[PDB]
Amino acid sequence: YDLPPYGDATLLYFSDLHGQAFPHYFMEPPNLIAPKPLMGRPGYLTGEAILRYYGVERGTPLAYLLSYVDFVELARTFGPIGGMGALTALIRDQKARVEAEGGKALVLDGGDTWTNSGLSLLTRGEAVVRWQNLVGVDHMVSHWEWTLGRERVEELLGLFRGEFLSYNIVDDLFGDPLFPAYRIHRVGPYALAVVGASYPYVKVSHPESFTEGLSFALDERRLQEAVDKARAEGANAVVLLSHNGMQLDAALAERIRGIDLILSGHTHDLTPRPWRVGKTWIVAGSAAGKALMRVDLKLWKGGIANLRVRVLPVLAEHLPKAEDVEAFLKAQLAPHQDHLFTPLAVSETLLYKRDTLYSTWDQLVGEAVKAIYPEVEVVFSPAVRWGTTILPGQAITWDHLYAYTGFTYPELYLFYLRGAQIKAVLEDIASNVFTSDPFYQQGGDVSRVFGLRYVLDPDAPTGERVREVEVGGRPLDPNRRYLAAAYGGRLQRVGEAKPGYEPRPIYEVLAEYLRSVGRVRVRPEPNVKVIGRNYRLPEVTG
Ligand SMILES: [Mn+2]
Ligand SMILES: [Mn+2]
C-alpha cells in the first residue's frame, strides 16, 4: 500500500461490489474456457497460468486474490477480502497519500454496486448509495442497478452525490441521452475526460418492466462522438469507465479512436498489469470489494504517456477501520442481525460460485431443489459472476444466501420442457459464451444444470458444441417431457408451468433445506466433459 509518487493523476477504481457490505471470501474461477482464438487473453486466464502471465509469486497476497490455486490455505492465511469498511479505509489512505504529494485523485465505481446483498435488499439499494456517499465516489456507471426498477434508480440518483455517467442510456423513442456521457477533470495544466458506458444488454438480461422506455444499445457512432467532443472541449486524455464487459471493451479499443484507458467492469476480471489493445490500456475492476485498483497516470497533451497500475488487496485483517462506515452498517443492520447472521447450516467443504460450467454452490442449490421437489428432473441455475465463497467448516447465513441469490426477481419456477428444448438451451448459451468474436461477447457463463450431464466442444460449429446429453443416467430423449426448475432467468417462458405450483423465492427454498439438513458436504462432481481442454477443480478441503 505504501507506493512512491507517480504521474499527474490517480484513479482509485473498484467495480462490481454487488452490495457486499462485509468482509467475505471470494475465489476466482477454476475455469474460464475460451474457443481457441481467444485462449491466453486476459479474461480467460486462471489457476497457475494467470500467476505465470502476471509474474505473480505463488503464496502471495496477490496470488490469493488472483487465482484459485491454494485458495483455502491462503484464505486461512490472509483473511477475508472486501467489506465496505476496509474498502473505505483503503480508498481514504490512498487518496490522502496522493493529495499530500500534490497529486489529484478520482474515486471511480464501475457499477453493479447497489444490488445483490442483504444490505441492498433490506433497503432497496439505499444503504449502498449512502455508503458511496460516505466514501466519496466521483462517478459510477451501471448494470444490475436497473433491477431496482427505473423509479427507484431515479430516486437513488437523487441521493447519490457523485455524477452518474453513461453515453448509451437513451430514450427508446426519441433517442435523446438521459445522462451526461462524460465529465472533464482538471489535472494541473492537463484535462482528463471520464466517459461512462453502461452494460448494453440490460433489456434482454432482466425483466422488461425494469427498463421500460429506455434503450442501452451499444452505439459506436455515439461513443466516438462523445470521445471526439470531449477532446474538442480540451480533454488531453480519455478514460472510459465501462460496464460493457472486458472482451467487448477490447473489441472497442480496436474500433474507437481516442480512448487512452478503459476501466473494465462486468466480467469481474483482475489485471495486475494493464492489457494493451490497439492504442488503449485496459484495467479490470475485479468484484465484491476484493481489490482497489490504483492507476497513476502521466499525461501528455495528446493522451496518457505512461501509467502505473497496482492491484491493492482489500484485506480487512490488514487495514485500519473506517469508523463512520462501521457505525453506519451497525445502525442499518442492527434490527436485522439475527436474521442475517444466525447460522443456517455448516458447510464441510468449499462452496464456490464462479466457473464457466460448474460450481459446488450451484450443485448445492440443485440438491436443495431436488430434495424439496423430488419430481424435478433438471435444475437450471443462473451462471452469474456475483456471489461469495464458503470455506470448509464455515456456517452459511442468510447474508450469504442473499449474496448468492439476491435477485430482485428471485422466484424459482417449475415447468416442463421437451428434451429437445433442454439441448437447445445449452447449445444457444454455448453459442454466446464461446463466440470467437469479442465484439459479440456478452460476458456471461453457462447455466449449471443439476440432473444432467453432457459433453462440450467449445471449438465445434454452432449446433455441434453440446452433445451426448444424458438426464438421470439415460440418453436425452428429444420428444420426452421433463420437469425442470429454474430461477434468475427467462427459461420458464418457453416451458409449460407445473400445475399447482406457486413460484417462490429461491432463497426461501434454500433456507428451508439448510435448516433441515444442518450440515452440507458437496463434493465437486462436474457434470461436463470438455473436448480439447483439461477441466480443473480447486482443493475443496482444508
Ligand atoms: Mn457484476
Ligand atoms: Mn454486470
Could you please report the per-residue DSSP string of 376-388? --EEEE---S---
Q: Where are the alpha helices (DSSP H) in 110-267?
A: 118-123, 126-135, 150-159, 202-205, 220-232, 246-253
Q: Indicate left, alpha or beta for 149 from its phi (over 0: left) and psi (-120 to 50: alpha).
A: left
Q: Indicate left, alpha or beta for 519 from its phi (over 0: left) and psi (-120 to 50: alpha).
A: beta
C-alpha 467 to ligand 1 mean position (Å):
30
Q: What share of the chain is helix, strand, coil (3-state, %, to 5)?
A: 35, 25, 45
User: From CA 401, how far away is CA 507, in angstroms rounded?
Assistant: 6
The H or E element containing residue 92 is helix 84-100
Experimental method: X-ray
Longest Cα separation, the chain: 70
Please say whether the beta carbons of 64 and 77 come within 8 A.
yes
* Three-state secondary structure call for residue 417: strand
139 is in an annotated binding site: no
How many CB atoms lie under 10 A from the CB of residue 342? Answer: 11
C-alpha 341 to ligand 2 mean position (Å):
27
Q: Is CATH 3.40.50.1220 correct for 1-25+79-342?
A: no
In the Cβ-directed half-sphere of 362, how many Cα atoms lie within 13 Å? 31
DSSP 143: S
- Torsion of Cα atoms, 430 then 149 then 403 then 383, to 10°: 0
Residue pointed to by grid coordinates 417449475? 414
Residue pointed to by grid coordinates 458506458? 197
Question: Residue 374: is it exposed, middle or buried by C-beta count within 10 angstroms (0-12/13-18/19+)?
Answer: exposed
From the list 106, 152, 105, 102, the residue with the least C-alpha distance to 128 is 152
How many CB atoms lie under 10 A from the CB of residue 515? Answer: 11
CA distances from 179 to 86, 141, 167, 396, 525 (A): 31, 10, 7, 40, 47
| Annotation: CATH topology of 26-78 | Helix Hairpins (6.10.140)
Q: Indicate left, alpha or beta for 300 from its phi (over 0: left) and psi (-120 to 50: alpha).
A: beta
Phi, psi of 330 (to 5 degrees): -65, -45
Look up residue 289 and give its three cell numbers. Answer: 470489494
User: From CA 309, how far away is CA 499, in angstroms rounded?
Assistant: 56
Phi, psi of 208 (to 5 degrees): -55, -40
Sorted by sequence, the CB contacts under 8 Å of residue 183 that are 6+ apart come out as 139, 163, 165, 193, 194
Look up residue 176 and give its three cell numbers. Answer: 435523446
C-alpha 151 to ligand 1 mean position (Å):
21
DSSP 334: G
206 is in an annotated binding site: no
Number of helices and strands in the chain (H, E): 16, 27
CA distances from 236 to 228, 233, 282, 304, 486 (A): 11, 9, 18, 8, 49
How many CB atoms lie under 10 A from the CB of residue 497? Answer: 12
How many CB atoms lie under 10 A from the CB of residue 532? Answer: 13
Name the pairing type of β-strands 481-487 and 378-381: parallel
Name the pairing type of β-strands 345-347 and 519-520: parallel
C-alpha 240 to ligand 1 mean position (Å):
17
User: From CA 81, how far away is CA 99, in angstroms rounded?
Assistant: 26
Sorted by sequence, the CB contacts under 8 Å of residue 474 that are 6+ apart come out as none
CA distances from 212 to 71, 113, 198, 208, 489 (A): 42, 21, 16, 6, 18
How many CB atoms lie under 10 A from the CB of residue 151? Answer: 9
176 is in an annotated binding site: no
Ligand closest to 199 (CA) is 2
Ligand closest to 246 (CA) is 2
C-alpha 290 to ligand 1 mean position (Å):
13
| Annotation: CATH topology of 343-542 | 5'-nucleotidase;  domain 2 (3.90.780)
Q: For the chain, what is the radius of gyration of the CA atoms?
A: 23
In the Cβ-directed half-sphere of 330, how many Cα atoms lie within 13 Å? 7
C-alpha 189 to ligand 2 mean position (Å):
35
Look up residue 18 and give its three cell numbers. Answer: 454487488
Ligand closest to 205 (CA) is 2
User: From CA 261, how far away is CA 300, in angstroms rounded?
Assistant: 14
Would you say how long the chain is, in residues? 542
> Read out DSSP for 177-220?
BSS-SEEEEEETTEEEEEEEE--TTHHHHS-GGGGTTEE----H
C-alpha 232 to ligand 2 mean position (Å):
31
Look up residue 351 and give its three cell numbers. Answer: 462452496
Q: Report domain extents, the chain.
A: 1-25+79-342, 26-78, 343-542
User: From CA 99, how far away is CA 104, in angstroms rounded?
Assistant: 6
User: From CA 235, how far away is CA 227, in angstroms rounded?
Assistant: 9
Resolution in A: 1.5
C-alpha 464 to ligand 1 mean position (Å):
30
Question: Residue 335: is it exposed, middle or buried by C-beta count within 10 angstroms (0-12/13-18/19+)?
Answer: exposed
Sorted by sequence, the CB contacts under 8 Å of residue 111 that are 6+ apart come out as 15, 16, 140, 141, 142, 143, 144, 145, 198, 199, 243, 265, 266
Look up residue 481 and give its three cell numbers. Answer: 417431457
> Read out DSSP for 446-486?
--EEETEEEEE-TTSPTTSSEEEEEETTEE--TT-EEEEEE
Angle of CA points 243, 324, 20, to nearest 5°:
35
User: What b/e readout covers 205-234, taking b as 16+ CB neighbours within 10 angstroms?
Assistant: bbeeebbeebbbebbeebbbebbeebbeee
CA distances from 456 to 102, 185, 460, 530 (A): 55, 48, 9, 5
